[PDB]
Design a protein around this ligand. Structure first.
Ligand SMILES: *[C@@H]1O[C@H](CO[C@@H]2O[C@@H](C)[C@@H](O)[C@@H](O)[C@@H]2O)[C@@H](O[C@@H]2O[C@H](CO)[C@@H](O)[C@H](O)[C@H]2NC(C)=O)[C@H](O)[C@H]1NC(C)=O
Ligand SMILES: *[C@@H]1O[C@H](CO)[C@@H](O[C@@H]2O[C@H](CO)[C@@H](O)[C@H](O)[C@H]2NC(C)=O)[C@H](O)[C@H]1NC(C)=O
Ligand SMILES: *[C@@H]1O[C@H](CO)[C@@H](O[C@@H]2O[C@H](CO)[C@@H](O)[C@H](O)[C@H]2NC(C)=O)[C@H](O)[C@H]1NC(C)=O
Ligand SMILES: *[C@@H]1O[C@H](CO)[C@@H](O)[C@H](O)[C@H]1NC(C)=O
Ligand SMILES: NC(=S)Nc1ccccc1
Ligand SMILES: [Zn+2]
Ligand SMILES: [Zn+2]
Ligand SMILES: [Zn+2]
Length: 446
């Protein structure tokens, strides 16, 4: 989760993650690009408001009051500079002075040309294989972060796409209470709460940015999958996109797609939740996918209908008490899928986003693995498109996004876990075309 220059013995002991940009008087002389006007090292702002009583384990989990259990000093970048050491630009800006505006367009995957489809599939496959140039992931919790001898930081390199999988896993993992004890599972820093939409928004933004530099294509953008067609089948599960069903194993991906070659990370819950370790960069089995195949559960055998999307966009309040998976008339809870498209809660309901996940009946529909299936990317750009249309329609009204008593991780000023540098839900609660440098080529049913 941290820049590789902060994943050292020195940086962790200091509590400071303020790396140099280009120092030309020695180390520590250009922290946060302070010798240019680009930024400065300063104290971390973290949320201290109370959370819901559902989490009773304050003091036990490194994700609490993120990121204070690892660092209390961060770079704050000046103006429209951005990045861990202020060496890049805020979303929507480019240039050495971050003063040239950019606006990329996220399009329906099915509307792209034959060349554009092939370029997207190989970019994803490239990101699955290419080491992340900036971030390394911890394989142990903080008390064991410096290794057995106390001088070996327990971080591993990880590919650009597996880092995308890993941050999601880390945001949903159970609180480890100790060997012999049962891990606590009624906690989720990115789902079942107001932060669901802003968390996944930043999640996509980080991956899109990483792939832009990996490809050195500033205009590269992530497409979306319109899953609200009411269809019986996954219309993007073809061998020119995301892969069709294997004729030799109906739960595997066609060998004529590169995605049949992918191997998943974070599939050892037995180990993590009993020995206290974290998901590491070692890959395991293949992606399992079986669209419409959950015969035991007929309600998740068909995708949402077009009118489901139109109805959830009529929900005018972003979220409602108790800001959880049982909220009624909450746009966030409706599009997440715990309530029906009108906002009516029913514990037996699976709609929209949750239904699209369960429709896959496989890796993409399992809470600890879902980003391993690259359909996750397209499922959530569409979910983000619905969010962006809501932001336009209701003038980005953040007033119902609670400042306190949300599920832990979901207060408005919580730093979304485990993103670095620290970024709050508020910073994502903005209309994308004017504030984040992207827009959706899409039209809404009516
Ligand atoms: C800011 O952080 C430093 C470094 O402490 C680390 O910060 C966290 C990652 C946490 O996990 C601590 O255990 C780390 O040691 C703080 O300075 C240290 O504070 C500890 C106890 O809090 C003390 O035993 C050490 O001697 C201190 N070492 C140094 C070099 O200062 C510092 O207090 C923090 N400042 C705050 C929180 O305002
Ligand atoms: C990375 O994670 C894997 C999965 O947890 C670790 O492999 C497991 O290790 C446990 C205990 O050492 C064994 O009992 C399991 O049989 C292993 N599973 C597999 C699939 O190998 C692996 O050791 C971890 N790597 C590091 C460096 O910690
Ligand atoms: C995919 O769907 C199948 C159902 O078609 C699930 O398998 C069933 O799981 C339930 C609950 O564990 C069992 O009671 C049934 O006996 C299973 N049926 C069969 C035919 O296996 C499976 O769990 C789903 N997998 C995922 C990842 O969603
Ligand atoms: C990550 O890869 C780098 C090369 O970029 C290599 O020096 C080292 O093995 C890895 N570093 C860490 C901290 O794991
Ligand atoms: N299964 C996945 S990936 N998400 C989810 C979570 C809760 C309820 C329905 C779906
Ligand atoms: Zn500042
Ligand atoms: Zn998610
Ligand atoms: Zn999801």
């Amino acid at each position: 989760q941290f820049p590789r220059q902060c994943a050292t013995v020195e940086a962790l002991r200091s509590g400071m993650c303020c790396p140099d940009l280009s120092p030309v008087s020695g180390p520590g002389t250009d922290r946060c690009g302070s010798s240019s006007g680009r930024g400065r090292c300063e104290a971390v702002t973290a949320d201290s408001r109370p959370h819901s009583p559902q989490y009773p384990h304050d003091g036990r989990d490194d994700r609490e009051v993120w990121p204070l259990r690892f660092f209390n000093r961060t770079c704050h970048c000046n103006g429209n500079f951005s990045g861990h050491n202020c060496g890049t630009c805020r979303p929507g800006w480019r240039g050495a002075a971050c003063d040239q505006r950019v606006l990329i367009v996220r399009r329906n995957l099915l509307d792209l040309s034959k060349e554009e489809k092939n370029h997207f599939v190989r970019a994803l496959d490239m990101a699955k294989r290419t080491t992340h140039p900036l971030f390394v992931i911890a394989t142990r919790r903080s008390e064991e972060i410096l290794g057995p001898d106390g001088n070996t930081p327990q971080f591993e390199n990880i590919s650009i796409y597996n880092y995308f999988v890993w941050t999601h896993y880390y945001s949903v993992k159970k609180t480890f209470l100790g060997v012999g004890q049962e891990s606590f599972g009624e906690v989720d820093f990115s789902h079942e709460g107001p932060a669901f939409l802003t968390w996944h928004r930043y999640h996509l933004l980080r991956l899109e940015k990483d792939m832009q530099e990996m490809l050195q294509e500033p205009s590269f953008s992530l497409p979306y999958w319109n899953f609200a067609t009411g269809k019986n089948v996954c219309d993007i599960c073809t061998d020119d996109l995301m892969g069709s069903r294997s004729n030799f194993d109906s739960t595997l991906i066609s060998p004529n797609s590169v995605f049949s070659q992918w191997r998943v990370v974070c599939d050892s819950l037995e180990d993590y939740d009993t020995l206290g370790t974290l998901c590491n960069s070692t890959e395991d089995g293949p992606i399992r996918r079986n669209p419409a195949g959950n015969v035991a559960r007929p309600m998740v055998q068909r995708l949402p209908e077009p009118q489901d999307v139109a109805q959830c966009l009529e929900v005018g309040l972003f979220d409602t008490p108790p800001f959880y998976s049982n909220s009624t008339n909450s746009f966030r809870n409706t599009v997440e899928g715990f309530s029906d498209p009108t906002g009516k809660y029913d514990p037996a309901v699976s709609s929209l986003h949750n239904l699209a996940h369960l429709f896959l009946n496989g890796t993409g529909g399992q809470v600890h693995l879902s980003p391993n299936d690259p359909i996750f990317v397209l499922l959530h750009t569409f979910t983000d498109a619905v969010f962006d249309e809501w932001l336009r329609r209701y003038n980005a009204d953040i007033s119902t996004f609670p400042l306190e008593n949300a599920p832990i991780g979901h207060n408005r000023q919580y730093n979304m876990v485990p993103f670095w540098p620290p970024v709050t839900n508020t910073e994502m609660f903005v209309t994308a075309p004017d504030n984040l440098g992207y827009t959706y080529e899409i039209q809404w049913p009516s």
